[PDB]
Amino acid sequence: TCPFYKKIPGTGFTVDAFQYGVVEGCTAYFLTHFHSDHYAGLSKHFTFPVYCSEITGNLLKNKLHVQEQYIHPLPLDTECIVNGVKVVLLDANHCPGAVMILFYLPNGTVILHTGDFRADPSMERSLLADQKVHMLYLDTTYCSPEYTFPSQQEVIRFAINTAFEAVTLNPHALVVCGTYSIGKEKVFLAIADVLGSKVGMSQEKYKTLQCLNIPEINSLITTDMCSSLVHLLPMMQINFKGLQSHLKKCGGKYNQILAFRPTGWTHSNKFTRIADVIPQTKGNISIYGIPYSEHSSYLEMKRFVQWLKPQKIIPTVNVGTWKSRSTMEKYFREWKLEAGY
């Protein structure tokens, strides 16, 4: 059964609610982004209206084969009427195609659902500037002060400099990058660009990337692994055994691998600055874990919420334990007393 924090009161609407069968009273199902925990349930057999971005729509059609007649793509930054209710989709600064949804309820209440997001000061100059929000449904993935990490720009600077230095010292090194979902494409794109290479990958991953409206993509990726010195592999293969095995397949072209495992936050962020990061090494294989986040840090989250000044907050992440729920409620009250709303 569909939980409360996925229902939008006073509408026929749900958000990221595809794993509960037919939801009673739902006339339109919104999908914030193409991550599996959120789309869980959609397929070619789905026959209700799905509302989403253009990019999410391309992924639904080509990867899950949802029929075209039930996909309703909406433009961003544009007031749209759905089943008699005004809605707006806004860029979430998460993975490609990810949105926040603003709902203007018939009774005058305004609701913002962030989906998954990485809060940024640029959001303070979207269509959010213009008006009040009564209820915020918030991505609280990293809602505690221990969760610190660098900007995406600093992380990419570290990865480009690391890869360019290695391959210039050794022209016979291969670079490998792990993936298991969409998002974080800047990691492997920026490395390939500095090295003058296309990125090589499986047919299944190439298909996924071709749905993402990235400019000049045909110039950046390929399924011809032999032509490429930056390869993508599933994230489960980013270990010494999986990498050894991959190097065997490359026909004596390479004599070293440098690999990257983009993660979220890890507890080494407590102690070690991005500049000071070192790899794990065995023989001619080295593996870097790099903290490239597509979710708000605690400080980014706090800034956003203190700017927006919502009347009520409903968390959408870490909701399963009493200790998590209590911790989150404490921080929301500090933020409110500090800022005066």
Q: Minimum distance between the CB of residue 182 and Ni ion, rounded to whole angstroms?
A: 9
Nearer to Ni ion, 109 or 181 (CB): 181
* Beta carbons of 3 and 95 less than 8 angstroms apart: no
Report the residue number, 35 or 198, with the smaller CB distance to Ni ion: 35
Name the strands in the sheet holding 256-263, side by side, starting at the edge strand that comes first in the sequence.
221-222, 199-200, 230-234, 173-179, 256-263, 285-291, 280-282
Q: CA of 294: how far to CAs of 40, 116, 120, 146, 176, in Å?
A: 20, 8, 11, 17, 21
Please tell me the chain's helix, strand, coil percentages from 3-state DSSP, rounded to the nearest 5. 35, 20, 45
Q: How far is the CB of 40 from Ni ion (least distance, A)?
A: 12
Q: Identity (one letter) of the amino acid at 97?
A: G
User: In the complex with Ni ion, which residue's Cβ is closer, 116 or 300?
Assistant: 116
Whichever of 96 and 289 has its CB closer to Ni ion, that residue is 96
The Cα 286–Cα 278 span in angstroms is 9
Q: Tell me the closest approach of the beta carbon of residue 79 to Ni ion, in angstroms.
A: 26
Q: Residue 42 or residue 175: which is nearer to Ni ion going by CB? A: 42
Q: 182: which DSSP letter?
A: S
Q: With respect to Ni ion, which residue has the nearer C-beta, 31 or 175?
A: 31
Q: Which residues bind Ni ion (CB under 5 A)?
A: 35, 116
| Helix and strand counts by DSSP (H, E) for the chain | 8, 18
| Residue 60 three-state SS | helix
189's torsion region: left (phi>0), alpha (psi -120 to 50) or beta? alpha
**Cβ 139 vs Cβ 317: under 8 Å:** yes
336: left (phi over 0), alpha (psi -120 to 50) or beta: alpha
Least distance (Å) between residue 110 CB and Ni ion = 24
Beta-strand relationship, 85-91 and 99-104: antiparallel
Q: Which is nearer to Ni ion, 181 or 284 (CB)?
A: 181
Min dist CB 116 to Ni ion, Å, is 4
